[PDB]
Amino acid sequence: VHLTAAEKSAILDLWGKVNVGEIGAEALGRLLVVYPWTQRFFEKFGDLSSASAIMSNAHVKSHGAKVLASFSEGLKHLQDLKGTFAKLSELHCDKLHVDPENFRLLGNMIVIALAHHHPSEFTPCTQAAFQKVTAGVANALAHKYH
Amino acid sequence: VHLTAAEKSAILDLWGKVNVGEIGAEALGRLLVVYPWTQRFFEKFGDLSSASAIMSNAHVKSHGAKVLASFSEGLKHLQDLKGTFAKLSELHCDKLHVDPENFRLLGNMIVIALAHHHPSEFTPCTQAAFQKVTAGVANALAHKYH
Amino acid sequence: VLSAADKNNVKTTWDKIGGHAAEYVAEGLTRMFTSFPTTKTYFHHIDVSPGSGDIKAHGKKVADALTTAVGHLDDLPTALSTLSDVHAHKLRVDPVNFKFLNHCLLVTLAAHLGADFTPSIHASLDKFFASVSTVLTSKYR
Amino acid sequence: VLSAADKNNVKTTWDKIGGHAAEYVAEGLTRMFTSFPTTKTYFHHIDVSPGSGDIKAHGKKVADALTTAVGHLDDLPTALSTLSDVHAHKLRVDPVNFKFLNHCLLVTLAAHLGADFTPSIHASLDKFFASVSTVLTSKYR
Ligand code: HEM
Ligand code: HEM
Ligand code: HEM
Ligand code: HEM
């Protein structure tokens, strides 16, 4: 994906205000609650059979934070997302066989977590910029499929 | 997408037996009947308000044949689908704004037309090879989105 | 398929939103037009500038239709039949556009409801909007 | 949402298929395992070689469940409740796998039915398989 300087600024201005681990814990938690088949990939974490269990699980919190730190690193490499995410693409595609639609769903959960915690800053224009970058990260993660 | 020599042979062996215009007319006809929102792109063709009308429409037949000749040309360029389909990607993405899921649906209609007319040849292994090439063509047509 | 718990989550949340529904749906439409500009093609006939009177008016129509759906959770196809005619037969709307709108509605609710937009409420609402979309894109009568 | 014409297309075609249903579903499973090899992960416990007795047996189970659905087109959620428990709660099957199977079932029917697999019959069957998938991937009871 190509992002304009305006879009990149809308993204990075908000990102400087974001608690990356808290966004990550919420986004991954919401993924598992809203799209329950995604739990199949994370059985080792413990009981994921209720929203209550998912949202209190320590591994969901720590893994969510790890995912969002990885996303943050991506934001430093907006002109080379495919290269940045190549090793993770090999992992998620060749080893884990995650269907790429699920990458887009997790991106949408990050968007929802941002709206929840930063409503005044998460304007329609700023959302639009984030939709482009979450789509870009999903496309990069899916590259080994193509 | 990467295709093995075995897969390419399964594809091209069957293709030598195929009536390209007839497959094309059937595949596009089935797209319009099965997924009716796709009719929005082809209003100029005439009445598309019934299966009967869609399957008798001369423009659906001629356009279907044109689509399948384009697909045939692609089969000559399996190591460079992105380059082969670049101009058509610009058209379908930047000018027509066709959602890429629809490229995959049309690929699946070509698969169904092949099974209909070549059941003995359309074995599970030969189908598998075709699924890879229709996915590849869809990905190439969608490239301007990424 | 919505569970009875999903239906209760939808009814309770919609009721809490109450008279803000039209305003929230207008915001959802503006979010859709902004994040997914290809959706604007269906609305060439109105002013789609952010904050426009035309978007406010359309947001009211859409909110009132969602109210009809919330009141008929056991039989959405009967309740939304005329709207399916509009969206499937007349306008031929590609289903991806509904995915775009539904996501933008959830983003709007997350922004306004905060902590009250729980993961469980979010899941029930996602199922509800998806069910409405399936009906509006079906040709059944 | 299926129209009454869709329901008639499904009933008539299923009846014509008759006792071939199990054989056709086994072929559909083999087409799925071959074209979409990631689906094999769910079937690690059986022999999934083409023509295997295990695939024949599973094809019979799936065909008989599709027969239950064809007999309950006005209320699939009630009729398929136990199977939703299996596929959504117990096995957590990603919905993409249903897209793969449904397509492979339609390819199988196109191969065996030829001209009798009309575009109209194809459309009704696509809607029917999609409706079944929506139920089997829902958590409602
Ligand atoms: C924004 C999209 C995503 C990003 C940036 C991301 C990033 C990561 C990272 C950084 C790791 C750790 C790699 C390592 O241990 O070396 C990981 C592992 C993993 N990811 Fe993702 N991921 C994404 C989406 C998904 C999705 C959608 C799923 C499945 C629904 C998934 C399933 C997994 C699994 C199962 C692991 C291994 C966990 C374990 O057992 O330790 N990921 N991912
Ligand atoms: C296998 C995938 C596809 C291929 C190979 C393909 C190929 C083509 C070709 C060769 C043309 C003619 C270009 C020209 O006139 O210079 C065309 C035009 C067009 N395509 Fe596609 N196409 C595909 C999928 C689709 C889909 C899924 C849609 C919409 C649902 C679509 C909508 C159109 C439209 C609206 C035109 C212009 C028709 C006219 O008004 O003359 N195409 N395509
Ligand atoms: C939550 C899902 C939706 C609901 C409940 C809904 C509801 C409505 C209602 C109540 C009307 C007015 C019908 C009338 O005046 O007779 C309408 C019209 C319309 N809808 Fe939707 N709609 C939905 C999604 C969409 C989407 C996703 C699109 C396209 C992106 C769309 C495009 C249109 C258009 C073009 C009209 C007619 C234009 C107009 O009324 O001025 N709708 N819709
Ligand atoms: C047309 C849609 C489907 C129908 C009607 C269906 C039906 C069934 C039935 C009747 C059973 C046996 C339940 C029992 O013995 O109590 C079953 C089991 C199972 N299904 Fe499905 N199924 C469908 C789609 C899928 C898909 C797409 C997958 C994964 C790719 C899947 C994976 C499984 C697994 C792993 C089992 C248990 C293993 C076994 O029975 O040996 N099913 N299904």
Author numbering:
A (entry chain B), B (entry chain B): 1 to 146
C (entry chain A), D (entry chain A): 1 to 141
Paper quotes:
Hemoglobin, the oxygen transport molecule in the blood of vertebrates, is the most important target for adaptations on the molecular level. Hemoglobins in vertebrates show the typical globin fold accommodating a heme group which reversibly binds oxygen to its central iron atom.
The crystal structure of guinea pig hemoglobin at 1.8 Å resolution suggests that the increased oxygen affinity of guinea pig hemoglobin can be explained by two factors, namely a decreased stability of the T-state and an increased stability of the R2-state. Superposition of guinea pig hemoglobin with human hemoglobin in T-, R- or R2-state revealed that guinea pig hemoglobin crystallized in the R2-state. The R2-state of human hemoglobin features the same special C-terminal conformation of the α-subunit as observed in guinea pig hemoglobin. In contrast the β1/β2-interface of human hemoglobin in the R2-state is devoid of intersubunit salt bridges, while in guinea pig hemoglobin two intersubunit salt bridges are present. Specifically they are formed between the N-terminal amino group (Val1) of one β-subunit and the C-terminal carboxyl group (His146) of the adjacent β-subunit. Nevertheless, we propose that the two salt bridges at the β1/β2-interface are an important factor, which increases the stability of the R2-state of guinea pig hemoglobin in comparison to human hemoglobin. Firstly, the salt bridge stabilizing the switch region in human hemoglobin is not present due to two amino acid exchanges (Glu30Thr30 and His50Pro50) in the α1-subunit of guinea pig hemoglobin. In guinea pig hemoglobin a bulky histidine instead of proline is found at position 44 of the α1-subunit, which inevitably will result in a steric hindrance between His44 and His97 of the β2-subunit. This steric hindrance renders the T-state of guinea pig hemoglobin less stable and therefore will result in a higher oxygen affinity since the equilibrium between T-, R- and R2-state will be shifted towards the relaxed states (either R- or R2-state), which have a higher oxygen affinity.
